[PDB]
Amino acid sequence: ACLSIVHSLMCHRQGGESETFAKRAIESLVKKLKEKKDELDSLITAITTNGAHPSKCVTIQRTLDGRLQVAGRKGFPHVIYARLWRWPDLHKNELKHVKYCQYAFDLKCDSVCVNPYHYERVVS
Amino acid sequence: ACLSIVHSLMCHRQGGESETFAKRAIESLVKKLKEKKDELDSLITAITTNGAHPSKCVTIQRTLDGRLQVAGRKGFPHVIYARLWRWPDLHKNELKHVKYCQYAFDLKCDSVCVNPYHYERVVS
DNA sequence: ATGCGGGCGCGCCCGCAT
DNA sequence: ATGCGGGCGCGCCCGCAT
Ligand SMILES: [Ca+2]
Ligand SMILES: [Ca+2]
Ligand SMILES: [Ca+2]
Ligand SMILES: [Ca+2]
Ligand SMILES: [Ca+2]
Ligand SMILES: [Ca+2]
Ligand SMILES: [Ca+2]
Ligand SMILES: [Ca+2]
Ligand SMILES: [Ca+2]
Ligand SMILES: [Ca+2]
Ligand SMILES: [Cl-]
Ligand SMILES: [Cl-]
Ligand SMILES: [Cl-]
Ligand SMILES: [Cl-]
Ligand SMILES: [Cl-]
Ligand SMILES: [Cl-]
Ligand SMILES: [Cl-]
Ligand SMILES: [Cl-]
Ligand SMILES: [Zn+2]
Ligand SMILES: [Zn+2]
């Protein structure tokens, strides 16, 4: 079910973390997008094609402090998913959202875009 | 400050738990009663005299599920403090509140009485 | 049907760097 | 002044006993 989607997204991880951390991060994301068909499809299409064709926002609700907790660890959610699918060595203040992204973390919306192809890497 | 109150209440623990668990449980309780002078005085007087002279209710806010967490462990708050100051071997369904107790756990109020001398031990 | 009981995240907290 | 960052509790969840 969601397990087959998680496995397909797992195939595109960059190895910056353990298999078990990546699994928990992907499971957490897929569960939030379960009742949001359009956002889930935009995520699978963006990850599966390695952001070949422009994709739409993939959002989750922002926490009060901005960090998302996965398997006991807290990090910014857009950073967690960009590290996982694009830049395994990604550090803080190294992301810049694309002009068309309407729910980017920096835009201070209760909905945060975690589409890794909605961000580009910059020098800190 | 609250540390001197915690030490005086610690002297009356029955040893059912570790020194460190008892300390965390007492610290948590004292902190909640810090801005409730009358309730804190009723607690110190009841514990210090071993419930010699009738005491008034000592309440904390009830959680949605009824259990209080102290140092990673969950238990009913009236049970935690009765185990700590009166019955170290206390088990579930072995407590019965006194007729004058208005905030007893069984009375389903958002305020729970944790005065151990507001309960008496019964057979389960 | 109803509750226990334990895993784990978000909210609160607070010490610390800058 | 402002934010990081990690500890820990209450809320949510869910498997399980009864
Ligand atoms: Ca559990
Ligand atoms: Ca701190
Ligand atoms: Ca600190
Ligand atoms: Ca400081
Ligand atoms: Ca610091
Ligand atoms: Ca900490
Ligand atoms: Ca469960
Ligand atoms: Ca279970
Ligand atoms: Ca069952
Ligand atoms: Ca069970
Ligand atoms: Cl990874
Ligand atoms: Cl890891
Ligand atoms: Cl969400
Ligand atoms: Cl951003
Ligand atoms: Cl004890
Ligand atoms: Cl113990
Ligand atoms: Cl309280
Ligand atoms: Cl009761
Ligand atoms: Zn976006
Ligand atoms: Zn009472």
Author numbering:
A (entry chain A), B (entry chain A): 15 to 138
Paper text:
Smad proteins consist of an N-terminal MH1 domain, which binds to DNA, a linker region with phosphorylation sites for network regulatory inputs, and a C-terminal MH2 domain that is phosphorylated by the receptors and binds other Smad proteins, LDTFs, chromatin readers, and transcriptional co-activators and co-repressors. The receptors for TGF-β, nodal, activin, myostatin, and other family members are membrane serine/threonine kinases that phosphorylate and activate Smad2 and Smad3, whereas analogous receptors for the bone morphogenetic proteins (BMPs) preferentially phosphorylate and activate Smads 1, 5, and 8. These receptor-activated Smads (R-Smads) form heterotrimeric complexes with Smad4, which is required for the transcriptional regulation of most target genes. Focusing on the human and mouse Gsc promoter, here we identify specific Smad-binding GC-rich motifs and provide the X-ray crystal structures of Smad3 and Smad4 bound to several of these motifs. The structures determined here reveal that the β-hairpin is flexible and adaptable to bind with high-affinity several variants of the consensus sequence GGC(GC)|(CG), which we refer to as 5GC SBE.
A complex with the 18 bp dsDNA oligonucleotide containing the GGCGCG sequence from the GC1 Gsc segment yielded data at 2.05 Å (refer to Methods section and Table 1). In the complex, the convex face of the DNA-binding hairpin dives into the concave major groove of the duplex DNA containing five base pairs (6-GGCGC-10/9′-GCGCC-13′). In the complex with the 6-GGCGCG-11 site, these three residues also participate in a network of hydrogen bonds with the first four consecutive base pairs of the GGCGC motif. Specifically, the guanidine group of Arg81 side chain coordinates tightly the G6 nucleotide. Ten of the water molecules are closely coordinated by residues of the β2–β3 hairpin and six bases of the GGGCGCGC region. Additionally, five more water molecules strengthen the interactions of the N-terminal helix α2 with the phosphates of the DNA backbone.
